C-alpha cells in the first residue's frame, strides 16, 4: 500500500485522543462503522462499533444504535511492558485518512525512557466489498535493540452507549460466549431486548518474511475483554508484519443461523486471500464510486479537499443491498441522535445518491416503504389517517423521538418535535418523487412510491383543519424546519409541502388509472382507495392557507412571525458562525424573528419552480439576515439559494460553512458524529448552486452556474434519466458531455435550449 | 475530623497517579486492604482491594492474593460532565496520610475550563475496630456557580491481578450477583477455584445540613460495574456532604449464611452510627496501639517521622482475631510476591508484635500451627520427615514459590528457593521460642509451640547427611539468606539454625516429660514421638559442621565461598544504596563474594548469645563490605549488628536506609507494595541496636545503648514477661519504669544490676 497524493489526504496534527478525529477518521462500509480511535485505545478515547440496523432500548428513554464491543484494539509490549505511545519521545508521527483508497494510516517512531527506538507503521480499513470484514496491518521494527515483543490483540466487550453522560449510560448487550478457537478469538453478544445477535471473530498473525515468527500464542479471558497474544523473539531491525482480520456478523443477515459458525467460516475464506488482495478489492470499490462522485474544483485547494472529505463519507456510508436501513443523522460515525433517521436523509443526503448512485437512493426509499405499517399505526395512535412517518426512525419505524432532554441552559425540557414536527411525512413523499423524476424508475413508482405518496397525502388530509369563517384549511400547533419556534400555526413550509403532497397524490391516482390500470387496481385493493379521495385531496389543497403578504411579496414563516422581536446579527466567531445577538434569552427564542435554519428558504429551494424570481429574492434577503445557522443543515441551503437568487455576497462563506462543518468543528459537537446532512448539503450547493443545475416544470434540466471569485473551474458528473452526464463549468462557459453517446438529453443552458 | 499535627503527617506533593503513594497510603485493618488510589480512579492508577486469606490460583503459576473489585470509586459530575481533576487548574492541593488517626485526607480546589471553581475536601479509613467497614466522607462546595451535581458511587469488578504484565494478568473472580437494594448497591463475587466468596454492600448519601438533599437517586448496571448516583440541585456556597460506607464480608468469617443478607444487615447497623462516631471508634483503636508502639526520637525529624510511618504500617496490618492468616511480604498493600508469607514475618516482623502486642504475634504463629499438616505433607513428598514449612505460604500451607521467573537481565530462569531454601523451618521454630520466652505463654508452648519445634527438628534430622570420611553431618545443596548463592553446601546460617532447632527440641522434650508429663504424653501420642528421637537429635547436632576458619575467627558463609572472586563495593546511588562494582555480571553472582543481604551476620544477630565480641566484629567487618543490600531485609540487620560491634557511623547509615525503604523508594519498587520486613527491621534496629536491648541467657534483659550523634533522646516501650516497660535513653543515662507490673524482671544496665 502506498499513500495517495496529499490532495486526497486528511491529516491529524498531533498524537492524542480526539473526539473530532474519531468522527472524521471513522470508517464505514454502510454496514459496519468504526470510530477513528487509535489502535491502543487510549484513556480518553470514545470507541464506536456499529452495525446498521442493530438497535436496542433496554433502560434507555428510546431505542439506540448499539455500541458493540470494540474489536480493533492492538497493543505492543517490550519485555512485558506496554509500549505506550503517549509515554515516549515521538521521533516521527504521521496520521492520515486516505480518501481515495479509504484507509486510515498511522506511522509512529517512538523513543522510550530506556532510549529504545521502535517503529510502528500501518493502516486499517472497513472493507467496502467484504461487508463483514475489518482489516488491520502494522509493521513493527525494533531499530536499535532486541527483546521479547508481545503483540496483544483484544476485543473489549465492556463498551457502553452514552459513555460520558452518567444518566444516559447503558450497556445494550450481554456476552453470550467467548472462545479461543485456535485460529483466532471469538466473542458473541445478544442485545438486551434480544432482537439482535452479533458475532465477532478476530485473527491476528505475526510474520517475518511471510512466515509465522512467534514462539508462543496465548489467550486470556479477563472478564468481558478477551485477548490474543503473540510473543516474538524480536531481533534488531527485522520487519515484523502484524495482520489482524476481524469479522462481524449479525442476525440481520440472510440467513446465517449461527453467527459463530458464520463468522468463523467467513474468516476462513478471508484467510485464503492476502492482506494485499483484500485491500485491492477494497480500493476497486472506491474507484468505481469516485469515478462518478468526485468533484474537481480548481483555484481553491481548501474547498477541493474539504469537498472530497464530504463526498467520501457519503460514498462510504451507503449500502444499496440493505433495504431495511437508512442513514442516521450522524451516519455510522457516532452516537449523537442515537443512529436515528430524520428528514436529513430524505432531503439533504438522498439527492447525492439519486444523482451519483441511484441504487443507494432506492434502497433508502425501500426503508421507508417497509415501515409503512408502522407509519399507519403511528397515524392511528395520534388520531390521524394514512401514513404518519415519525420524526425519528430506527428499526421498527415507530416514533423514537425522545420526549425529554435539556435546553441550551442545561435545564430539563419537553421535546415536542416527535409530537408536532409533522413535515417529515411530506418530505418523504417529496423525496420519492425526486428519485422517480431523476431516474424515470416507473417500476418503483408503480410498486412502491405511489403507495407512499398516497398514504402521506391521506395523513395530510386528516390533519388539515377547515376554518369556516376564513374559507381556508389550516395546520396548527406545529414545528416547521425552524425548530426555534414551537406550537406555530400555518408554518408556510409545512402548509405548502402538505398542499404539494395532496396534489401529487391526486395527480398520481389519475395517472395510474389512465395509464397503468392494472397497477391502479392492485394499489387500490391493497390500501382501500375510494373514488372520492382524489377529489377530497384537490379540495383541501386548493384552500390550504399560505401566510403571504402580496403587497410586500413576503412569505411569513408562520402566522404572527412578523410581530415577534427583531434582532441584528452583529458578529461571527473564530469559525465565522453567527454569535447570539446581545439581548437574547436562549429560552425565549420563540419571541424573536431569529431562526435556526432555512424554513421559508427551504420551501423556495424545494418547490422553486412554483414561485417567481422577485419572490425568491425578496424572501431570501429577509430570512438570510435573520438566520443564526444553528443547525449544520442551515448553511448549505443558504449557499445554494443565494446563488439561485443572485444574492452571491455570502454564498461562498455559507458554502465553506457546510464544507468545513466537521473539519473545522464549526458547530462545536463534531465529537458526536459526522454531520451527515451537511455532507449532502455541500454536494447539493455545488451542483444545484454553483454548478447552476435546476429542474423545471417539464423535467427539463436548466443550467445557470455562478463560480465564486477563486474558482476557475468546477467539474462534476450526474446521472439524469439513465444518462451519465459530465459538466465542466468555467468563469465564462458551460460544457455538458454525455459519457455514453446515445439517447437524447434536453437542457436549457443559460435560457437557451440545447439537445445532447 | 481535624488533622493531626504535621509530625504525624506524610504528604504527597502533587496530584497525580502514583504507584509509590498507592503503596505508602494503602490503608488496612489486617482484614481488608486498600491501595492509596485517588477517589476518582484515574487511568494510570493500580487499585488494590484485598481480603486477608483470600487467595486464588486459576490460570496463574501459583496461588495469588486476589485483587477484588474496587469499591471506593467516587466521581462528581456538573451538569452531566465529569469534573476530572486532571483536566482542571489546581488552585489548591493537599493530600496526607495522618499516621496518628489512620485516615487518608485530600483537599482540592479546582478551576475548570469553564471558569467554575469547586472545592472537594475529605478523607477515608478502613475501620480498625469494624473490620468489615470502609468509610469515605467528602465535602463539595461550588464556589462561584450553581448547577446540577451528580455524585457517582461505583463498584468496579473489572479488576484483575498483574494488570500491567500481559503474560501474567489473571482475573481471579466471577461476578455472582449485582443488586440495587434501595439503601445501597451490592455486588458479590466468587473466586475462580471457588475457595472464597465475597459480598460488597455500599451506601452513599448526599446531605445539606444533615438532610438528604438529592432530588433523584438512580443506579446503573454497566456489565461488571455497578453505580449508585445522586442528583443535587447545588447552590453556590452551600456545603454538600457525601458519605460512603462500604461493607466487605468473606466466607472466611463465621456464619455468613446468605452473603447478601449478612452484608446488607451489617451495613444497616453501621448506618445507625454517624461518621464521627465511626471515626472516633477508629481513632480510639489507633490510640491504644500507639500508646505502646510509638517511638519518640529527639534530634532528628526525618528519622522520627519515617519511624512513625514504619510503625503505622505494622500496627495497621495485624489482626490478632484471625489465627488462619499471617503477614505477606508486602502486607496487604500490593500484589508484590502475591501475598505470600515468608521468613520476613517470623524473623523480621514478628518481634515488633511480640514486644508491642504479643496477641498479634501469637495469632501469626497459630497460622503456622494450623498449617502443620501441610508442612508434614510437604516434607513427605520431598522424601523428608517431620514438618518442612514451605518457603512461600498462602492459605493451604503448601509450597507456593514459583518455579520460573526472570533474572536481573530479563531472561527466563529457574527459581530454586522453594526447592532448597530450607532455613524457613528453623526460622519458624526460632520465632516460636522467641515469642514464648518474651511472654512466658506456657499454654501456647504446651498446646501448640512444642509440636512445631519438634516437627521441624524431625525435618532437620531427616535432611542432615553423614559424611563418613570427614566425620560430620552436612546439609548440602541449599540456598541460605544470601540468595545470590544457589546450590551451596553447608551454609553456616542454615547449619547453625538446624543445630539450634535440634537441640532446642531435645531440651523441650526433657522439660515436657519432667514438668508437664501429661502434656508430653498427649503430644507424644499425637505425633508418634518415640523415646529415642531426642538422643538422635542431640547426636546429629553435636556433629553438624560449622565452617569456622580459625583462628581468623571468620565464619565462612558456605563451603567454598572464600575461594570466589572478591569485589570492592565502591559506589552508591543518590539514596545511598550500593551500586554494582564494575566487572560484575548479573548472571554470574554465584562466582563472586558479593552478598545480597545478611547471612553470617544474620546468624550473629539471631544466635548472638553464642559468639564473642571479637568474633562478631571480624565477621561484621568482612561481610558488610561485601553486602550489596539488594533486599530490603539487608540494611536493618547491619545497623543493628553495626551498633552491637561499635562500628557506628555505618549504623546510622544502614538505619536510614531501612527507615526510608518506601518513603524514598530506595529499592526502586515500592509500587509493588510495602516492604513489610524492613518495617520490622527498622523497629528492631531501634530497640535492639541503638536502644541497647539484648536478652542473654537466663532471660536477663540487658541494656547497652549507643545513640547516634544526632540523637538527643530515644523513648520506647516493650512488653517483657507481661510487664510494660518504658525506656528512655539519652547520650549519658538510661531509665526504666514499669507501666504495667507482672513478671519479675532481671535487668542489667551496662554490666550493672538495676531495679525498676
Ligand atoms: O433527538 C431529540 C431532538 O433533539 C434536538 O436536538 C433536535 O433539534 C431534534 O430534531 C430532535 O428531535
Ligand atoms: O440533524 C437532526 C436534527 O437536528 C436539529 O438540530 C435540526 O433542527 C433538525 O432539522 C435536524 O433534522
Ligand atoms: O517469589 C519467587 C522468589 O522471588 C525472588 O525475588 C525472591 O528473591 C525469592 O525469595 C522468592 O521465592
Ligand atoms: O521479601 C521476600 C523475599 O525477598 C527476597 O528478595 C529476599 O532475598 C528474601 O529473603 C525475602 O524473604
Pairing of strands A472-474, A465-467: antiparallel
Q: Which helix (H) or strand (E) holds B250?
A: strand B240-250
CA of B299 to the centre of ligand 1 (A): 71
Between CA A475 and CA B20 the distance in angstroms is 69
Between CA B153 and CA B17 the distance in angstroms is 20
CA of B409 to the centre of ligand 4 (A): 18
Alpha-carbon distance A477 to nearest alpha carbon in chain B (angstroms): 31
Q: Which helix (H) or strand (E) holds A163?
A: none
Please tell me if the CB atom of residue A62 comes closer than 6 angstroms to any atom of ligand 1.
no
Rg (chain A; Cα; Å):
27
Q: Which ligand is nearest to the CA of B406?
A: 3
Of the candidates B632, B646, B629, which has an alpha carbon nearest to the alpha carbon of residue B682? B632
Please tell me if the CB atom of residue B329 comes closer than 6 angstroms to any atom of ligand 4.
yes
Between CA A275 and CA A312 the distance in angstroms is 22
CB B205 within 8 A of CB B212: yes
CB A430 within 8 A of CB A500: yes
SS (H, E, C) A288-347: HHHHHHCCEEECCHHHHHHHHHHHHHHHHHCCCCCCCCCCCCCCCCCCHHHHCECHHHHH
CB-side neighbour CA atoms (13 Å) of B688: 22
> What is the phi/psi pair of residue A369, to 5°?
-55, -50
CB B692 within 8 A of CB B360: no
Pairing of strands A185-191, B64-65: unpaired
Question: Which atom from ligand 4 is nearest to the alpha carbon of B675?
Answer: 1
Of the candidates B54, B267, B152, which has an alpha carbon nearest to the alpha carbon of residue A168? B152
**DSSP per residue, B65-131:** E----EEEEEEEEETTEE--GGGSEEEEEEEEEETTTTEEEEEEEEE-TTS-EEEEEEEEEE-SSST
Q: Please state whether B673 falls in left (phi above 0), alpha (psi between -120 and 50) or beta.
A: left
Please tell me if the CB atom of residue B482 comes closer than 6 angstroms to any atom of ligand 4.
no
- B483 given a catalytic annotation: yes
Chain B hits for A152, CB-CB cut-off 8 Å, are 166
Please tell me if the CB atom of residue A337 comes closer than 6 angstroms to any atom of ligand 2.
yes
Question: Which atom from ligand 3 is nearest to the alpha carbon of B405?
Answer: 2
Instruction: Give the CA distances from residue A443 to residues A204, A516, A724, in Å, rounded to whole numbers and listed in that order.
Output: 47, 11, 20
Between CA A384 and CA A401 the distance in angstroms is 18
Between CA A356 and CA A361 the distance in angstroms is 9
The contacts found for A692-698 with CB under 8 angstroms, 24 or more apart, are A692/A643, A692/A729, A692/A734, A693/A718, A693/A727, A694/A608, A694/A609, A694/A644, A695/A437, A695/A609, A696/A609, A696/A748, A697/A609
> What is the phi/psi pair of residue A488, to 5°?
-85, 160
Please tell me whether B596 is known to bind a ligand.
yes
**DSSP per residue, A392-427:** SB-SS-S----SEEE-TTS-EEE--HHHH-TTHHHH
Q: Please state whether B544 falls in left (phi above 0), alpha (psi between -120 and 50) or beta.
A: beta
Between CA A376 and CA A386 the distance in angstroms is 6
Residues facing residue B158 across a β-bridge: none
Among the partner-chain residues B81, B167, B171, the one whose CB lies closest to the CB of A223 is B171
Q: Please indicate whether, in this complex, the C-beta atoms of B220 and A169 are within 8 angstroms of each other.
A: yes
Between CA A407 and CA A246 the distance in angstroms is 41
Residue of A nearest to B173 (CA): A223
How far is CA A505 from its chain centroid?
A: 29
Between CA B583 and CA B580 the distance in angstroms is 9
Please tell me if the CB atom of residue A285 comes closer than 6 angstroms to any atom of ligand 1.
no
Between CA A103 and CA A309 the distance in angstroms is 13
Give the active site residue among B483, B486, B556, B624.
B483
Q: What is the resolution of this structure in A?
A: 2.0
How far is CA B605 from its chain centroid?
A: 21
Q: Whose CA is nearest to atom 10 of ligand 4?
A: B481
Q: Which helix (H) or strand (E) holds B593?
A: none
- Interface residues of chain B, partner chain A, Cβ below 8 Å: 43, 77, 79-82, 147-148, 150, 152, 157-158, 160, 164-171, 218, 220-225, 227, 229, 410
CB atoms within 10 A of CB A610: 12
Residues facing residue B147 across a β-bridge: B234
Given CA atoms B161, B163, B165, B170 in this order, what sign does their dihedral have? positive
Q: Please indicate whether, in this complex, the C-beta atoms of B167 and A160 are within 8 angstroms of each other.
A: no
Q: Whose CA is nearest to atom 7 of ligand 4?
A: B631
CB atoms within 10 A of CB B248: 26
CA of B85 to the centre of ligand 1 (A): 32
Please tell me if the CB atom of residue B39 comes closer than 6 angstroms to any atom of ligand 4.
no
Rg (chain B; Cα; Å):
27
Q: Which helix (H) or strand (E) holds B456?
A: helix B450-463
Chain B hits for A221, CB-CB cut-off 8 Å, are 171
Q: Which ligand is nearest to the CA of B392?
A: 3
Given CA atoms B705, B706, B711, B712 in this order, what sign does their dihedral have? positive
b/e code B659-685 from CB counts within 10 Å (16+ = b): bbbbbbbbbebbbbbbbbbbbbbbbbb
DSSP state letter for A446: I
Give helix A634-644 / helix A651-659 axis angle, nearest 10°. Answer: 150
Q: Please indicate whether, in this complex, the C-beta atoms of B164 and A43 are within 8 angstroms of each other.
A: no
Among the partner-chain residues B150, B166, B224, the one whose CB lies closest to the CB of A166 is B150
**DSSP per residue, B652-707:** HHHHHHHHTTTTTTTTS-GGG---HHHHHHHHHIIIIIIT-EEEEGGGEEEE----
Q: Please indicate whether, in this complex, the C-beta atoms of B171 and A229 are within 8 angstroms of each other.
A: no
DSSP state letter for A638: H
CA of B619 to the centre of ligand 2 (A): 86
Experimental approach taken? X-ray
SS (H, E, C) A472-483: EEECEEECCCCC
Cell readout for A276 is 494485499
Domains and CATH numbers, chain B: 1-255 (2.70.98.40), 302-687 (1.50.10.10), 688-756 (2.60.420.10)
Cell readout for B48 is 488494590
**DSSP per residue, B377-394:** HHHHHTT--S----SSB-
Amino acid at each position: 500500500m502506498k499513500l495517495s497524493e496529499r490532495e486526497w489526504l486528511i491529516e491529524q496534527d498531533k498524537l492524542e485522543a480526539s473526539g473530532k478525529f474519531e468522527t472524521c477518521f471513522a470508517l464505514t462500509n454502510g454496514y459496519i462503522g468504526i470510530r477513528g480511535i487509535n489502535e491502543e485505545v487510549f484513556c480518553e478515547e470514545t470507541p464506536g462499533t456499529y452495525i446498521a440496523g442493530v438497535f436496542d432500548k433496554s433502560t434507555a428513554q428510546v431505542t439506540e444504535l448499539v455500541n458493540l464491543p470494540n474489536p480493533i484494539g492492538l497493543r505492543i509490549y517490550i519485555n512485558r511492558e506496554f509500549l505506550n505511545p503517549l509515554k515516549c519521545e515521538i521521533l516521527e508521527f504521521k496520521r492520515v485518512l486516505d480518501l481515495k483508497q479509504g484507509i486510515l494510516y498511522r506511522k509512529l517512531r517512538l523513543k522510550d525512557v530506556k532510549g529504545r527506538i521502535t517503529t510502528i507503521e500501518g493502516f486499517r480499513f472497513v472493507s467496502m466489498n467484504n461487508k463483514n470484514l475489518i482489516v488491520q496491518k502494522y509493521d513493527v521494527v525494533c531499530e536499535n535493540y532486541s527483546a521479547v515483543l508481545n503483540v496483544e490483540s483484544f476485543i473489549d466487550a465492556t463498551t457502553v452507549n452514552s459513555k460520558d453522560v452518567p444518566n444516559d449510560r447503558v450497556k445494550h448487550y450481554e456476552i453470550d460466549k467467548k472462545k479461543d478457537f485456535a485460529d483466532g478469538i471469538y466473542l458473541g453478544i445478544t442485545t438486551k431486548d434480544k432482537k439482535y445477535k452479533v458475532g465477532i471473530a478476530s485473527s491476528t498473525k505475526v510474520l517475518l518474511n511471510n512466515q509465522r515468527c512467534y514462539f508462543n500464542r496465548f489467550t486470556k479471558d479477563l472478564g468481558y475483554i478477551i485477548t490474543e497474544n503473540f510473543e516474538v523473539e524480536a531481533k534488531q531491525g527485522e520487519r515484523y508484519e502484524i495482520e489482524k482480520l476481524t469479522v462481524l456478523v449479525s442476525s440481520r443477515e440472510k440467513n446465517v443461523g449461527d453467527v459463530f459458525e458464520t463468522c468463523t467460516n467467513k474468516l476462513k475464506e478471508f484467510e485464503t486471500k492476502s492482506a494485499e488482495k483484500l485491500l485491492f478489492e477494497h480500493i476497486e470499490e472506491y474507484k468505481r464510486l469516485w469515478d462518478v462522485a468526485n468533484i474537481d474544483i480548481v483555484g481553491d485547494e481548501v474547498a477541493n479537499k474539504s469537498v472530497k472529505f464530504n463526498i467520501f463519507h457519503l460514498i462510504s456510508m451507503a449500502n444499496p443491498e440493505d433495504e431495511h436501513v437508512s442513514l442516521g443523522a450522524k451516519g455510522l460515525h457516532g452516537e449523537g441522535y442515537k443512529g436515528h433517521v430524520f428528514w436529513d436523509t430524505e432531503i439533504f443526503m438522498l439527492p447525492f445518491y439519486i444523482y451519483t448512485n441511484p441504487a443507494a437512493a432506492k434502497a433508502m426509499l425501500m426503508y421507508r416503504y417497509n415501515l409503512l405499517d408502522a407509519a399507519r399505526e403511528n397515524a392511528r395512535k395520534n388520531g390521524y389517517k394514512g401514513a404518519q412517518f415519525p420524526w425519528e426512525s430506527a428499526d421498527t419505524g415507530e416514533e423514537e423521538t425522545p420526549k425529554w432532554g435539556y435546553d441550551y441552559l442545561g435545564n430539563p425540557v419537553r421535546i415536542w418535535t416527535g409530537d408536532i414536527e409533522y413535515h417529515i411525512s411530506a418530505d418523504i413523499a417529496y423525496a420519492v418523487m425526486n428519485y422517480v423524476r431523476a431516474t424515470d424508475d416507473i417500476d418503483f413508482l408503480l410498486n412502491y412510491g405511489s403507495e407512499i405518496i398516497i398514504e402521506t397525502a391521506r395523513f395530510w388530509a386528516s390533519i388539515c383543519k377547515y376554518n369556516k369563517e376564513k374559507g381556508r384549511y389550516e395546520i396548527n400547533d406545529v414545528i416547521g424546519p425552524d425548530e426555534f419556534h414551537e406550537h406555530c400555526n400555518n408554518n408556510a413550509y409545512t402548509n405548502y409541502l402538505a398542499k404539494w403532497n395532496l396534489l401529487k397524490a391526486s395527480e398520481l391516482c389519475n395517472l395510474l388509472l389512465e395509464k397503468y390500470p392494472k397497477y391502479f387496481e392492485k394499489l387500490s385493493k391493497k390500501i382501500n382507495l375510494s373514488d372520492e379521495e382524489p377529489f377530497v385531496w384537490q379540495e383541501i389543497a386548493s384552500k390550504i392557507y399560505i401566510p403571504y403578504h402580496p403587497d410586500k411579496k413576503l412569505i411569513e414563516q408562520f402566522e404572527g412571525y412578523f410581530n415577534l422581536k427583531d434582532f441584528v446579527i452583529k458578529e461571527y466567531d473564530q469559525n465565522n458562525m453567527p454569535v447570539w445577538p446581545e439581548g437574547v434569552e436562549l429560552d425565549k427564542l420563540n419571541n424573536y424573528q431569529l431562526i435556526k435554519q432555512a424554513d421559508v428558504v427551504m420551501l423556495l429551494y424545494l418547490l422553486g419552480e412554483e414561485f417567481d424570481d422577485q419572490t425568491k429574492k425578496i424572501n431570501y434577503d429577509y430570512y438570510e439576515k435573520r438566520t443564526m445557522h444553528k443547525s449544520s443543515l442551515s448553511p448549505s441551503i443558504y449557499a445554494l439559494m443565494g446563488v439561485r437568487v443572485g444574492e452571491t455576497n455570502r454564498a461562498y462563506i455559507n458554502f465553506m460553512r457546510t464544507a468545513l462543518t466537521d473539519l473545522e468543528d464549526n458547530q462545536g459537537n463534531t465529537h458526536l458524529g459526522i454531520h451527515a446532512a451537511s455532507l449532502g448539503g455541500t454536494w447539493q450547493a455545488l451542483v444545484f448552486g454553483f454548478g447552476g443545475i435546476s429542474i423545471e416544470k417539464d423535467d427539463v434540466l436548466s443550467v445557470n452556474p455562478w463560480l465564486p471569485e477563486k474558482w476557475e473551474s468546477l467539474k462534476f458528473s450526474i446521472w439524469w434519466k439513465g444518462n451519465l452526464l459530465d459538466f465542466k463549468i468555467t468563469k465564462d462557459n458551460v460544457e455538458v458531455k454525455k459519457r455514453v453517446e446515445k439517447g437524447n438529453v434536453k437542457l436549457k443552458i443559460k435560457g437557451q435550449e440545447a439537445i445532447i
